[PDB]
Design a protein around this ligand. Sequence first.
Ligand code: NA
Length: 109
Amino acid sequence: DTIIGFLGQPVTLPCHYLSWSQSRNSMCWGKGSCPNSKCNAELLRTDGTRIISRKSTKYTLLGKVQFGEVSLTISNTNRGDSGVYCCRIEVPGWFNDVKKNVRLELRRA
Ligand code: NA
């Protein structure tokens, strides 16, 4: 997946976990491709119901976390926001987290 967005404007990087369970799941977004464990350069983390942690108010989730609507919205993009991002759905048990890399390209307005 490559998302194309405009500089100075927001973008939404898509990430969905259809069978999300409030008592079982959690997730994080990070900058760079997903490492073996957790998120590198974490930008945002949820528990089962809500955002519990955030790098800054530049990053948010517009959808419902409870229903696995965990697409990341990045306000007011600049060139440094370009590149690969990691969306990581944390799943109970071992070696089974759903990891996904999303590339973001940005163009001049
Ligand atoms: Na796991």
